[PDB]
Amino acid sequence: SGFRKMAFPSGKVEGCMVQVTCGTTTLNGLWLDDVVYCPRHVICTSEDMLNPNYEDLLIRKSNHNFLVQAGNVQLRVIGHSMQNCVLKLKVDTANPKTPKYKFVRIQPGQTFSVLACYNGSPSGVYQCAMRPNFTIKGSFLNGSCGSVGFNIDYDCVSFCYMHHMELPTGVHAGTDLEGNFYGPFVDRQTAQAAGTDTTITVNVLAWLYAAVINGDRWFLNRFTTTLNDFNLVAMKYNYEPLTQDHVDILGPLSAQTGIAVLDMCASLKELLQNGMNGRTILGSALLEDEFTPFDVVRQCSGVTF
Amino acid sequence: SGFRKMAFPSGKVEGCMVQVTCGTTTLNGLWLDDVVYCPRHVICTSEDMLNPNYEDLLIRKSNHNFLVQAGNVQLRVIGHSMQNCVLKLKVDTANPKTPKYKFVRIQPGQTFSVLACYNGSPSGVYQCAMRPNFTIKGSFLNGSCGSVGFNIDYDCVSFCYMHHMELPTGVHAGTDLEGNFYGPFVDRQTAQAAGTDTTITVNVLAWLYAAVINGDRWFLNRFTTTLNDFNLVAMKYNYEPLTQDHVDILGPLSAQTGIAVLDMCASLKELLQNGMNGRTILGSALLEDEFTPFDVVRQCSGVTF
Ligand SMILES: *[C@](O)(C(=O)NC)[C@H](CC[C@@H](C)F)NC(=O)[C@@H]1[C@H]2CCC[C@H]2CN1C(=O)[C@@H](NC(=O)OC)C(C)(C)C
Numbered sequence A, B: 001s002g003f004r005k006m007a008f009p010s011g012k013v014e015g016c017m018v019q020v021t022c023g024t025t026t027l028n029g030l031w032l033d034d035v036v037y038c039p040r041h042v043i044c045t046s047e048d049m050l051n052p053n054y055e056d057l058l059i060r061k062s063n064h065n066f067l068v069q070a071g072n073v074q075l076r077v078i079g080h081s082m083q084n085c086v087l088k089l090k091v092d093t094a095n096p097k098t099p100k101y102k103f104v105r106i107q108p109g110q111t112f113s114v115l116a117c118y119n120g121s122p123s124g125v126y127q128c129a130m131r132p133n134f135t136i137k138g139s140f141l142n143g144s145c146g147s148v149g150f151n152i153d154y155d156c157v158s159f160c161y162m163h164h165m166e167l168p169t170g171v172h173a174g175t176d177l178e179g180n181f182y183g184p185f186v187d188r189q190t191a192q193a194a195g196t197d198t199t200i201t202v203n204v205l206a207w208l209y210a211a212v213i214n215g216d217r218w219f220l221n222r223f224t225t226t227l228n229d230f231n232l233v234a235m236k237y238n239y240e241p242l243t244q245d246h247v248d249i250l251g252p253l254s255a256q257t258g259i260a261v262l263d264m265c266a267s268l269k270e271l272l273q274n275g276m277n278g279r280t281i282l283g284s285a286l287l288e289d290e291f292t293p294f295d296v297v298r299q300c301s302g303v304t305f
């Protein structure tokens, strides 16, 4: 038993991290087969940042201007192209440590692990959620751009995030591995705050199921609710609407515990309207919303990769 | 910016995980050079568990009784011995992925990462602390025994923990890699509850420094305190005494922020005596004590491995 915010093992991604330098800018790249993926702003200086013309800056670069280092070995660049906000550098060596992988664009509310890197070397790993407002609550310093986020399924690494920027209040924005930003953000140093965030309701419910599985049951009340009446309360507290798809996805946890989803919703309604009164759930004094239903099942059933 | 509970990248440890089976018992082992380390209770059945005589059970095993699997390849066992609560199985193949490593016995209050594994395969990674009562607050299911905890320094993996058991209230107990338990615990299924835990004061202070570095400054008051007067308050709230060694270890964070340790102690005293009043610090509604001073510096300065 026990319940922790748990990241995926990072080794398969570690073997893909490299350093990319263009001029005086160094950041991280992801080396898969014979291509290195990195943020296109590697070709910028600081002054370039208020409003860079990336297409124009890239036309004046050639392959040899990109210094790609995998550990202590330089990888020779033999082609390059831009796809949205990412650069793809073709190198003359395929990465022998390339895992089975996919590029996937995740949905708001889904979680993934981030391998934070500097100069192509890993610093740490932690679990995040794609917030409803398309930011993530990460931990990134200058030099971390190009760090990626990912899920693992068995042997397959699904890359879903590449880090580009920090928005006001210390939250983070980036792209999928096709270079398309999550949310309305752009890779330039201009005012662009995130929309107001919301709480991921289906994940709070999943985490309440995790608490029951772990024997932390004090918040279960004797009532039920309709989906419509629950969502009227969730709205007031800035929770996202719960959909029937969400109810179905909670099915496995509901079946394991014998607690119908709408009964758990009645317990959550009471927590929202009355607070916790100084009590904790799974050691937390706040309701946690960065575990998905699958995260709870994976951790409570010992799924391995 | 941002501050997350951040684990070490796990790849170097992933490459050392194997499965060990003896009879009907399977758990995890750690393969370094030509030795596999695992909990000695791999040689037990369930009935053996109330009070096993491990020396007696082991005398009736021979090398071939140990099925060691590294992925899909069986490793032939050519010798075996018991050291305290761990078995050391000599195998005829050295692990080519062995990292530079050490075995280290950590102190209460120090943190490490756990790579939770089942059947020799990694499930996830998370950061823990060795509690003052010599337990850890982990996430472990049956099948996770032999999972290890570790720190990394540059290229060197310092292994400090191997998982053996779960104690009442869902907390965890284990050994160093020499097989000596942390705390007064024994590897048998008998009543043996943990001592009453305490809060790791130096770590709470480190985390308050992390909050200041991240701009979350509301709790800083205008006062100072003596070390003695602070410790009288810490005692009442079940905080561990703060020592001069602790004050010195907080030096780097104190210097970075310009806040003297004893001034931060005055702010912590006020939080203890008055509570948070519904406010959060670094997103938490409780005072966090599982970041060491070094953890804060590593994360806020981008230390890599
Ligand atoms: C990466 O470009 C990097 O690591 N480069 C070596 C950095 C990472 C910073 C951490 C704190 F997230 N990000 C930036 O500096 C990005 C730049 C690329 C896209 C826009 C450029 C500015 N920038 C920012 O994050 C700024 N964000 C901003 O303007 O948001 C509105 C800022 C944090 C520097 C103010």
Ligand SMILES: *[C@](O)(C(=O)NC)[C@H](CC[C@@H](C)F)NC(=O)[C@@H]1[C@H]2CCC[C@H]2CN1C(=O)[C@@H](NC(=O)OC)C(C)(C)C
Residues within 6 Å of the ligand: A001, B026, B027, B041, B049, B140, B141, B142, B143, B144, B145, B146, B164, B165, B166, B167, B168, B172, B186, B187, B188, B189, B190, B191, B192
């Ligand atoms: C490992 O032995 C394992 O994974 N084996 C395949 C397990 C891991 C259990 C998770 C929940 F931590 N641990 C045990 O089952 C240990 C046994 C080895 C040492 C004592 C044996 C019982 N045991 C326990 O953890 C028990 N703890 C206990 O008796 O504490 C006082 C218990 C959790 C099964 C009750």
